[PDB]
Each structure stands twice: as C-alpha cells, then as structure tokens.
C-alpha cells in the first residue's frame, strides 16, 4: 500500500500527532514500513 | 558498530535512546573528530 | 566538503526544509559550522 | 593568525602558564580553537 499523503511525515509541532508512513505505524492503518526511513531520535521513541 | 547489552537487560532502552541522541547532537562526529585527527601525527595540513 | 568551506566561487545549496538544511544548523564541527555561516547571508538564494 | 592555522610547519608555542595560555583553551573561535588543537598534541613541547 502507499501512504496517501505522499510524505515520510514528522510530528506536528502542537497538535502531537504523526502524519505520513509513521503515522501509519504507529496509529496501526498498516503493519510494517520496508522504505527509505531515516532513523533519527524522534521515530525510535514511537516505532522499532 | 554497536554497544553491545545482555538480552532483554533494563539497559536495551536507554542505551538505544542514548546513541541517537549523540549522533543528533554530532557528539559522535566531533568525538571521531578527535580521536582520528587530533592526535593525528600528519594531519592534512601537515601533508599539506 | 573541505575544498567547498576554502572556494566560495562555487555556490552550494541545500532544499528550503528537511534534515539536510537541520544538520549544519545544530553542527558543531570545524569544516561545518563554517558551511553553515556561508548559507546564511548569501542572496540570491541557495535553498531551494 | 590565521595563516598559522595553515602552515603547520613553522611551530608556534606559548609559556608554561599565564593567561596567553588559558585563553586559547577556552576559545571558540574558528581560528583559535584549531590553533589549541595544534598546541595540544605537539610532541617536543611548544610550551616553554
């Protein structure tokens, strides 16, 4: 499946919530992410 | 390279959470930085 | 990237946001930091 | 100053103790940083 938004997506900064592939990871709409996600500080705190 | 942690140890959260937050500041580069170049007998100006 | 910090007739440019233009930002190297103060005040722009 | 940054074969000292000394060690500046770094691991001693 692709994510719709067409972005690796970021947590907003005052709503809190994830938009883009990691949104869809932790908010549960698909169950694994094989794609260019870069491991950064704020996606190992939400996602393995 | 990794630092390595017993399995399943308490320290398999902190320690991973810990090396991402290094290598966001660049306190990983600036220590590479200086074990490989600041005691460096021929730097590359020293070639230079 | 040491041989673009000394030439600065060759103008060098990253994208308007992203984690690219965020890491000479918050970099503290030598070669880095002074890559960063050459994106600062050039205009016309090099973001993209 | 600056073009004793980049000409490392002429090798410049200061004394033992005293202020010229403490005030290369607490710099953050471009240029005099890196000429501490050179103080630093320079084997026979610079330091008179």
């Known amino acids: ?25 932790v908010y549960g ?13 704020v996606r190992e705190e939400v996602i393995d | ?7 399943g140890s308490s320290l398999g959260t902190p320690v991973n959470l810990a090396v991402l937050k290094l290598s966001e500041q660049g306190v990983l580069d600036k220590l590479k930085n200086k074990w490989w170049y600041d005691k460096g007998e021929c730097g590359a100006k020293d070639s230079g | 990237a040491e041989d673009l910090s000394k030439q600065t ?16 930002r918050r970099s503290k190297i030598a070669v880095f930091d002074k890559m960063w103060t050459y994106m600062r005040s050039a205009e016309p722009s090099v973001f993209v």
Do not use: C, H, Q
Not at chain 1, 3 to 23: H, L, S
Not at chain 1, 29 to 41: E, F, R
Not at chain 2, 1 to 7: E, S
Not at chain 3, 9 to 24: M, N, P, Q
């Open chain 3, 9 to 24: 007739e060759i103008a060098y440019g990253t994208l308007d946001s992203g984690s690219t233009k965020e890491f000479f």
């Open chain 1, 1 to 25: 499946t692709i994510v719709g938004d067409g972005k690796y997506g970021a947590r907003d900064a005052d709503t809190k919530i994830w938009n883009g592939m990691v949104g869809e990871l």
């Open chain 1, 29 to 41: 709409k698909a169950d694994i992410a094989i794609a260019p996600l870069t491991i950064t500080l």
């Open chain 2, 1 to 7: 390279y990794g630092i390595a942690t017993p399995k």
